[model samples]
Target: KNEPVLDIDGEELRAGEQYYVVSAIWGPGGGGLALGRLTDQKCPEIVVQRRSDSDYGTPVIFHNLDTKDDIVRLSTDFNVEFVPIRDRLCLTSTVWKIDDYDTSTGKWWVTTDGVKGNPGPHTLQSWFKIEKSGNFGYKFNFCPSVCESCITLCGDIGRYGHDGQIRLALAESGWPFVFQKASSTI
Candidate 1:
């Protein structure tokens, strides 16, 4: 059987696999983005879900934590647009901008819109940049280190993990996140 190779920003993110959306400084002295689910007592589901099950090739969807009646989408076409940066870095639908973390907050070979084309101060709260490398990683907003790439995230899970919110933060602690990029068939 020939399996269709799915690529996310020139990488693989099939189900049953783990990869860090790390920052640019991800190496012997770097770390990656910390991931966690978005949750709300007022909401239906306990953990927010990444509604990636969209068309064959389109922007990924973000759904509320309601596993049953999950209909709320986190982003719209207008909200997710491409805006090129330096060094062949182009924003794509795969990567989404952090419109407003608090619509309630928030990727690619895909990347956001802020004040027309500029993100302004709201950079950290309006963008999700995915990086491809030995330790796949990502970051939110702007990268103080490299204004070009997103900062690497590093945090916990559970009540403080991927519980339902896209709680991504900058990776200050320079810890080379050499996590194994497990393989999967998907």
Candidate 2:
């Protein structure tokens, strides 16, 4: 019930460590796709960037939303953490947040409009979970348990299209990914 989450190297994932969330499937570039924020918006939305050799897009850290522990375990609720210059420029939050349902697109997009570290109803939409997929990869979900009395719209985190952009959104099945810990220099 408390299995520790492993990274791409099969090592236990520790909290506060930076990692690149790459797609499980390899692309034509012989590398996995990475998660990056769409830079055009005030509260930039999360997107799966194209595969590349040089960079794996943005790196993110994870925090145990409930226990606030040092070890990150599987199937446990956690907040996806990232620090970007745009957030500092726009004065938005650093953690991932599920945006309000888009009526036109019928999707709840993930964005960086969440509070950091603190856990409560105010930050309920920010909490996410890492679950083991059947294909030996991990998937993210939006079923948060931080606030017991809060009602949440639970769903697996997946990729959805928006104006030709592949944005992270809630769907029937999650997009499988493997964690690649960032190098010390990054």
Candidate 3:
């Protein structure tokens, strides 16, 4: 099942990287996850979790599937709008990037089912910073199509929210994000 490399936000992520893509959303076309990457330190990275109508639109981490170079990993600590392409297109909604491992901070947004700046904060603050939270379900799934300005996040749940989030994060040494890197390192 070895597919060719795919382009991400202009950069090329090889097939081995599990970055199979198609139709040219960020780069070439083939078949895989069509995600975007931001280099801005404050861009607020994030992940788009889509359920199967039976669950909610809970947030999760999008770590770099490839363990090669670059400190890349699915983020959940940003609040903005992006085109989530999962082999196809889904919705045109604004996703929030909640940072999970921001230790030393008071009353972290993390609840029982959460992560690095997970989804709590954004809901706590609000979507578009206007205080909003969708239903217990997201718009994402494993398919190959597009609907213009859509964010189709197609995948399965792997330990998410609350305790699961903390355990997983601590398990991975605070994962790819430690929100404290900029200040704590000093």
Candidate 4:
């Protein structure tokens, strides 16, 4: 049976609402990691920014965030969408897209070039899903069920360190996280 994704407060996560994606575990490189973007090759690549007393990283809204069926659920495919709060890139309506496989790096880097609200070869890299982790937290998966005929690269979303920066990339295991509504109390 499918289950609804919940926030840190045990409340159901709704579409259109802003929330911080936080690391569910606590340790070195852990504890309150929030999703944010960093400049890479002139493009704002999505990355998890470590949250501190002053910063909670960039807030994100799921593409389905404003739909009639606004409840986000586990094990369901949806576009992990974001609109840059800053106009630095001048690019809007972005979603998580696994960059093409790189022979030099041997990693599929996650970027923001994905076009939101469409299903096809063009938007294949934009589809992602959330699943229940072995722990109490949830993890992200890049398995698009939006287009059956479209080829896809399936893997768990995890962190990889590049030049001292932690980026979300396809990995052997999923990086578990929990949602905390932007308006909710800590």
Q: Clashes per prediction?
A: 34, 0, 44, 2
Per-residue C-alpha lDDT of model 3 across residues 39-78, encoded as one tens digit per residue: 3422233342222222222222222223243332122112
Predict model 3's lDDT versus the native.
0.24
lDDT of 3 at 99: 37
Which wins on TM-score, candidate 2 or candidate 3? Answer: 2
What lDDT is reached at residue 80 by model 3? Answer: 31
Instruction: Write the candidate numbers in order of decreasing lDDT.
Output: 2, 4, 1, 3
Off by over 4 Å in 1: 1-58, 61-116, 122-124, 135-167, 172-186
TM-score of each: 0.26, 0.85, 0.19, 0.85
Worst 10 residues of 1 by lDDT: 74-83
Cα RMSD (Å) per model? 15.4, 3.0, 19.0, 2.7
Better of 1 and 4 by TM-score: 4
Candidate 3, after superposition: displacement of residue 122 in Å?
28
On lDDT, the leading prediction is 2
> Each candidate's lDDT (Cα)?
0.26, 0.73, 0.24, 0.71
lDDT by residue (49-132, candidate 1, tens digit) is 122322111113321122233222211111222211222222222234332233222311111223222333334333322222
Taking the tens digit of each residue's C-alpha lDDT, what string does model 2 give over 1-186?
588888888888888888887777665332333335554654444545454544566778887765557888877888876644343544555678898888988899887767666677887888888888776788888888778898889988887667765678899888887888787433
- Superposition error at 167 for model 3 (Å): 12
> How displaced is residue 98 in candidate 3, in Å?
12
Displacement of the residue 103 alpha carbon in candidate 4, Å: 1.9
